[PDB]
Structures are given as structure tokens and as C-alpha cells.
Symmetry: D2
Subunit: 303 residues, 4 copies
């Protein structure tokens, strides 16, 4: 039957002074609650271990580095992995990754897939970085992702997580059809990730009231056109004076939203998932092999 129960663990705000230990307690509670409701996997938000630090311009590099993980998992996060293995529930965790390679301090906006045995099965590094690189005074709050992270270097992989083929996306990635399609072409049955999406956009404020719409539209369209179940976990609420979007969701291969959060705090939602459901699209209206004419899509891949 190839069935499972997918869950999404939305997070309420994470204060700048909130410790990773405190955040892990909140993550543990949601993972535990999810498991008790039958979930075999739970998706957590992007950069789920800290406040969304890209909203500030840092002058002290040591301060910036404090928001990154140099180990995964480290002693502080270890408990989450142990509980995942115990209860047999995998998860997708987003965090800031700092790794020194060949004399370079590399920083990535990262996410990992952990199976029901508590083992890291795959990693993904955010490829589409939104925002800017330099401080901009006209903004009530910054979004320096291009300053704090370099574009991911692992491409868009699809991993075998227990019985499912899963692909990861991180926040802004969900808005790019290329990210979805590459993973769709790689057979992803589930495409999931998290996000920190302020409901106010300094550059184009006239789209503020469409924040929920644009988020859900991207999730629904991606799922439908690739015949993939999808899930998006947001960190929402008023975090350090910046309102973040909620509406975390789980979407069927038809693009139908099957589960949606309604609060702006830590919230768990679940939905029954039949991996064979993807066939309704992938063996018919979106039977890639039978319908696609790649000879005409060259421009999409031009450098």
C-alpha cells in the first residue's frame, strides 16, 4: 500500500536570547506529539534552532558565528535524534551550517533528512538565496541571506528515507519551479522544507496582503505539476518585532491542501500519505517520459 503519516511541526517565534536547549525542548514536544498521532516523519522549519538572524547586520563575526552549528548533531541537539529513533519518527531539520574547508569558512542555510532510526540520510543546502548582501537603511528589518550564506553546492538531491523518496527545499526555494522539477525528475514522492517568511516585504510592500497566497500557490503548484506530496513548516508569529507567516501545510500530489495550521505558535498537523497516489499524475497527465520534449527546454539550463 505504501502508506505513512506525514507531520509538520510549525514553530512559534524563537527569541534572540532563546537557547538551543530551550528550542530542542519545543522540538521534542512536537515530535513526540506527532508520533503519538501516528506520524512516521515530521518536517520542521528552516533555521529551526535559532531566531532568524539574517534580519540584522552583524559587525562582530564571533556574534554571527554563534548562530551556526559546527556539529550535527551536537550534544544539545542529540536528544532530538535519540527521541526520533526511540519513537520511530524521522524528521527534516533546518539550521545554519558552518564548516571550514581549505582555509575558507563556509556558511550554508542547511536542512537534513533523518530517518526513523535517527540517522542522517541526506543533506541539502539552500540554492536560492533571497534578500541582499549589504545593509540597507530603508528596510525596517534586513534579510541578509546573501551575506550570511553562499548558494548551496549539493544541487537538488532526492534521498531514500525509510520507504519514501524525499527531496528537500528551503524557504525561498519553494517559489522556483526549477527546484521542484529537478527533484520531480529524480522521482521524489515527497518534497518538504521549512520557511521564515515575513508578512512584510520592504522592496515590494504592495504584495504584503498576498504573502499567504504566494506561499500556498507555490506549494500547491509544485505538488500538482510534479505529482508529489509536499509539506512546508514555517516558523511564524512576531519574532523580534518582525511578523512571520504561518499557514504551514501538507499538500497532496494533486495540489490539494490536506492539512493547514491556523495558529502562529508551535503547532503540529498530520495527514495520511499514500506514496502510490503520485501515480495519478505521474503515469498520466504528467507522465514525463511520454509528454516532455526536453529539446525545447534548453534555455532553462543555460548559464
Amino acid at each position: 500500500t505504501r502508506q505513512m503519516i506525514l507531520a509538520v511541526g510549525q514553530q512559534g517565534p524563537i527569541a534572540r536570547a532563546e537557547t538551543r536547549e530551550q528550542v530542542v525542548v519545543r522540538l521534542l514536544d512536537m515530535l513526540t506529539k506527532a508520533a503519538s498521532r501516528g506520524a512516521n516523519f515530521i518536517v520542521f522549519p528552516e533555521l529551526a534552532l535559532t531566531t532568524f538572524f539574517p534580519r540584522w547586520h552583524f559587525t562582530d563575526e564571533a556574534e554571527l558565528d554563534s548562530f551556526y552549528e559546527t556539529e550535527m548533531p551536537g550534544p544539545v541537539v542529540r536528544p532530538l535524534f535519540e527521541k526520533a529513533a526511540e519513537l520511530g519518527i524521522g524528521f527534516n531539520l533546518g539550521y545554519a551550517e558552518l564548516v571550514v574547508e581549505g582555509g575558507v569558512k563556509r556558511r550554508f542555510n542547511t536542512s537534513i533528512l533523518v530517518d526513523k532510526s535517527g540517522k542522517i540520510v541526506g543533506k541539502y543546502r539552500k540554492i536560492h538565496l533571497p534578500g541582499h548582501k549589504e545593509y540597507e537603511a530603508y528596510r525596517p528589518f534586513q534579510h541578509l541571506e546573501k551575506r550570511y550564506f553562499e548558494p548551496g553546492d549539493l544541487g537538488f538531491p532526492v534521498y531514500d528515507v525509510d520507504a519514501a523518496k524525499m527531496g528537500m527545499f528551503i524557504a525561498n526555494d519553494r517559489r522556483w519551479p526549477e527546484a521542484w522539477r529537478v527533484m520531480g525528475l529524480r522521482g521524489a514522492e515527497i518534497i518538504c522544507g521549512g520557511y521564515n517568511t515575513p508578512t512584510h516585504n520592504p522592496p515590494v510592500p504592495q504584495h504584503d496582503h498576498l504573502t499567504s497566497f504566494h506561499h500556498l500557490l507555490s506549494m500547491q503548484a509544485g505538488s500538482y505539476q510534479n505529482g508529489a506530496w509536499s509539506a512546508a513548516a514555517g516558523k511564524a508569529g512576531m519574532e523580534e518585532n518582525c511578523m512571520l507567516l504561518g499557514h504551514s501545510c501538507i499538500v497532496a500530489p494533486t495540489g490539494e491542501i490536506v492539512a493547514l495550521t491556523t495558529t502562529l505558535e508551535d503547532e503540529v498537523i498530520t495527514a495520511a500519505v499514500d506514496l502510490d497516489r503520485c501515480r495519478e499524475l505521474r503515469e498520466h497527465i504528467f507522465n514525463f517520459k511520454q509528454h516532455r520534449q526536453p529539446q525545447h527546454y534548453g534555455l532553462i539550463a543555460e548559464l
Copy 2:
């Protein structure tokens, strides 16, 4: 000159024996009404000169050929072009194209762009052909496009139509992000086309109640993610005992539906279009040059 009024001329059913002369009378009426309401361009349906013949299994090539145009325009369709020039309103007309090359017949599901001077300024040939190849006895109506048409050989071009950069899609094409993206990368400000979409799908009837949803979801996502205005003109209603989807629409570059038809007969809808609105997406959240990482999209173009 960055302002204009776009119109969609949805068609009601076209009977198997309804003549092109009769159909041209209907098209003339809609183009004339669109112009009277300020429109400078009107989008018509896919295969807008005949009934949707791909629903039948033909056994006589002469009968099949009767539904194709050997010239564009011929004496029968010429009046539409003359009226377009007269009133200063261009149009997108879909039709079945039959070409004879050195004794070889080429068949395409085609659409053309005509400017406000009544001159053909661009052509497109359906690349994504839906349906099946052989007669399937269980179906109340067939969908043999793969047998009656060859996949388009013009790619997804974008043409200058008066003061706008316009790209064309034909029916099923609207569900493929690759089609939208290629035209998006080519700077299309308006992406338009028509469609004949039965509200019943024999192989996957469990999606029948989602026909409107999938159609609108595709139009909205495509527009939003490419920062393009879009329009889709359907031929709707009970045509030869098969119910076709209505909900013809005009969409803003934000993915917002600005105009929608509510009947299943010939119906004109219009909407004010500012070509500079595209910038809200294309110079920011979807600033292609600044955010895309094409080195990771290669799989999309692999044959």
C-alpha cells in the same frame, strides 16, 4: 506606451457541422465588442475554428483533413483580420494547421499572434500533446491529439506584438512550468493561449471535480513565478455531448486573477494591463539574473 487593455474571447461550443463562416461571425462579434470596451488585443481559444475533432477516432484521412487550415488566413477567415486592423485590436487565434512539404503532410495544433494592424507577427505549435495514441473502446470520447498532431517544432518563442512582448501556449502547455519558464527567460510580458478541457477525464476521473482548480492553479502559478500577465481563452460548454471547461481568465503578474468568465457560451472579458507591473516580480523576488543557479537545473534539459 506601457498601458493597454487585454481581452479574452471565450467560445461556446462549435458543432461538428458548424461552418468556419459561422464561427468567424462569432469571433467578429467578440472582437468588435472587446474593441468597443477598450481592448487592443483579444485572446481566442485553441482550435477556435472547428469543433474539437480530436475527440473522435477517424478512419478517413479526407474527413480528418477537413478540420485543418491549408492557408492562414483564407477567404473565410480574412474578415476577422480586416476587422482587427480596422478597429486596432490584435488577437491570438488557435487552429489546426496542415502543411504539405514535398508530398509530406505535417499536422500541428497551432496558434498565431496578430497585431492591431491585422498582420501575423508570430506563430507557435503545441509542444505538449495530452491524451493517448490509439483508440480506447472504454472512453465516452477519445483524445487523440498525439495521433492528429506532431509536437511543435518552433520551441516557445516570444514575439513583439505592437508594444508588448507576448508568448503563446496552447491548452495542455499551461500545466508545464518549462513552457512558462522558457518564455519567462525570453522576457514575455504577456503569456496567452486557449484551451479545450473536458471536465471529465476517462483514465483519471477522480480528478474531475478539480478541473477548474487545476486550470486556474496552472495559470496563477505560471504568471506569478515568471512575473507575467497571462490569459487563457477556453471553448466551453456541451460540445458534441462532451462538457468543456469554462473559467476563461486574465491574470496579473502576481498570479492574481483579475477577470473570469462565468458562462459556458461566447463571452468577452477585459482587464487593464500595465506592462511595467512585471517589474514587481522580475526586478525583485524573481530577479532571474540575481537568484537563479542554472548550473543545477541541467536535468530539466536532458533528453
Copy 3:
């Protein structure tokens, strides 16, 4: 905290020859699955024990009567109540009620609320009967609810079901704001019911493609304007050659759909429910006592 887990048990078709015993097996499976996922209450469809008989014109009264329950519960349905008490999960069951009073054979389209102790806490009889009274040859299938049922005589009550105030609606009732408002004025925190909604409407077929839209619009609007959680359980799929609408759902007091079914078969969905959530609407934007001016609504109650 006043929290609970609400569930909806959508039904696939029920054949005319399917026995109540067989249907009870299907109901038991969904109630059991719901309970295992934490649900404390599950909503079942309207007339959930038989095929939707109003689609046929009966000449034999004995045949018609066979579709009605003269006992509730009877030996056949007893198991459902016993399992509800055992697992501590209440339910809303719809069925055809036949009762002889004062020499009259009374027929109602009925629904009951059963608490987690397996006890019937309240009854409701469908007040808004759609359809017609006499056979109509132009219809591919009838909808003789006005012939087979008399309008409910219990008004729109709200009952205490365990820790929640619950109101019942039956199918067509969900489209009437009066039904929702009366129960809203009676403090309902949850408003639930089921439905058999063909996706084809003989009288006004031009609305067929809007069947899902009209259903969800009614559920969403009712919940929002009354600050009530709501749930609708449909019996969907191809039942005796008539396609019935799916999209069973659970909706928050804000009108946000939090759970939705995607198949057309027996399907269980659940959602976490916080009864205090109603306050976000009922103590503010929809604070009835502070905002309503009943002196101007008289016409709504005029006979």
C-alpha cells in the same frame, strides 16, 4: 485548555445491494482508525447506512420503507455504539428515520450526536430539503427528498456533547446562513454534518464545475461568520451511476480549512480542535451582543 481531536469519516459509495451490516463494518473501521489517531469524535455522512435512495422513484412503499431505520440503534448498528463507548470516541450518524405517530408514517432525513460513552445526546431532522416531490423524466437521476422526507420538526438545536457544544446540519442545510446563525446564537462551538452531493445538477448543470467551490464556500463562510469549528462528511464516488462530491473537511472558526479529504472512498481525516479558539471571533469582530441590531432582521423570520 478545552482541546480535543475532531475527525471526519468520509464514505465511498454504498451500493443499493450493500447491507447495513457491511456498511457498519466500514463505519467501525473508520471510527477505530480515528480513535487510534487521537480523535474523540468522528463525523459520518448524511444517510450513512444506505445508498442515496432519493435518486429513484419508488412505486412499492414496502421497498421505500426498507431504507429507513425504525430503531436507533438496532441490533445491526449496535456494534458501532459499543465501539464508540469502548474507545471513547463519539460520532455524528446520519440515517433515514421512520416513525409512526398518531396514525401517520413520519419520515425524516435524520442525524444524531453520540458521546464518548456511546449514548445518544441529541437528534436533528433535516429542515432544508432540496430537490423535488414528483418524478421528473428530464433528470438522469432524481432527487426526491421532498417526496421521501418531511421538513425537520426539531428546529436547530445545540447539544452538550461531552465537553463541547455541538450543532448539527444535514447536507443542503449547510448552504443556508439561517441554520448556521441559529446554532451560532445558541453558542455552538462545533457545527457538523454530512452530505450526498452529486457533482451534476440537472436543473442548473452550468454550475457543475463549481460543486466543490460551493460546498467549501458554504462551510468556510458558516464557520467564520459564527466563529465555529465545522466539519462535513460526504459520501462520495460513483454510487449507482451517480458521481458524488468528496472534499470532506474540517474548518476552523476563522473559516480556514484545516483538513480535507482527497480520495472518493472511505477516508478519515482529523484535526486538533481548541474550543477557546471560537473567542477570537465571538468576543471581537463577531461579538454578537455588541454588534448585532436584531431590530433590523425581522424579515428573515417572517413566515
Copy 4:
């Protein structure tokens, strides 16, 4: 004569010191453009002659009074009426009404219907006043409508405007089914009005991202359940540092949105209206006389 073209003239912000003469220039422009595109009636916003003054806590009655109209029309607004008669296009204008009766001041949030001859044919006074009564220090902006306006005393009338039966609602009124229903029971074919809806709500900010949703949900449900065309004209944009909702719209009696504004400035949208379309709902699924059971709706009218 059952056909017409309805228009909505959405307004951008109106500054505190912006004069009525300047505002009339803006209204004239929209009414003129609507007429040039075929409209015979244009709906304008609630309190369309001034900034939304209820956002402030007034301490000087003379200052408060300055935002009200003592006559309608006065010399300043007269030009709009003359142009309406000239071009043959009626309108719905919202404004603050100040009436002096035997030394007693009466204050109302009012709207009037003017026909294509420039004659006032109907008035309505906002019955559902949102917000609070006293100054609340924590709010970035107040909403003291309950202090500056008395609930309307004209009920929810329906007037003959040229060839259409039209009913009026004002802002918050659109969220109350009782308002729509009374006009529905009175045969309204078009129910219209305007609004000033901040995208931020101080007491319940957790619904901020749902502002568009709740607005459109109310318009769609109201239209559908009363089989009425509807239109809502908002005054949108950043007005005096408070962001107001846009998404002005025209809706079919099916609840389908046929036209929607996408900017936050003065914007005209139009849509073809067939008054007989109402029959699709009112002579069938919502045939009031045949389906309603008012003897059970009594609680709705109880004082």
C-alpha cells in the same frame, strides 16, 4: 433591459488635509473612465470624501464635524452628480452624514445610490459598527466608529436604480449574513458598497494575514447564498500611516469573483452584468419560497 456593465472605483489613500475638491477630481476621473468602458453604474468606497478619520481619538467636536457632510450634494460634490447624469452612469457614494434635528446632532456612516440621471434614489446608514467605544492607548491607530456614528435607522432597504434592484452595505456590514439576507429577501439583484479595512487588527492581529481571505469570503458567500451580483469598492493603500486592504471586487450571483483590483491606488474595474443570472440560484437551489422554513429562524430576530 436586463443587461448592464457594473464598475467599481477603488480609491487610493485620501490624506487628512486632502480637500473634497481634490477627491472629487479623483472620483470624476474614475467615473469618466468607467463610462468610457461601458459602465452604467460605478460603486465607490465607504466614506469616500475624506481620510478614514475614525482612526483618531478626537477631543474637539468642531474638528470631528469637519469630516461630515451637512448637505448632499453640496457645491463641491455637485460636479460628480452632473457628470453622472451627463455620461449616463449612476454611482454608490459613501460619506459621513451630519444631521441637525431640533438642535440635536445625528451622525451616520452613510451611502447613497444615484441613478444614471444623476438623481439620488436611495440611502442607507451603516448598521454594523465595528471597533471600540473608548480610546485604547495600546493601539497604533484607533477605530472609534461606535463613538462617531449611530447605528443606521433605515434598515437594509433595496431600491430601484434605473433597471436594477440594488441594495447597499457598508464595510463591516458585508461580514454579516443578516444584512445580505434581508436584501436578498427583498429581491436585490445587486448588493454593493465600499470599505476601509486595515490589514492590521490590534485586538486580534493573529488574523492579519487573513484580511483578504475574510473580505473575499464574505463577498463570495453573500452573493452565492442570495443569488445576487455584488461589488465592493475599497479605499486602499497607506493612508495616514495605516495600511488599508485593496482587492476591490465584482462578484457573480454564483459567488464567483469576476473582476478584482490588483493595485492600492485609484483603480477602475468593470464586469458585464445580466440581472437574469440571479435566477440560476433564486429559482432553484435558493428558491426562498420553496425551501426556507422561517418558523425556525426566530432566534435571529430576537432582540
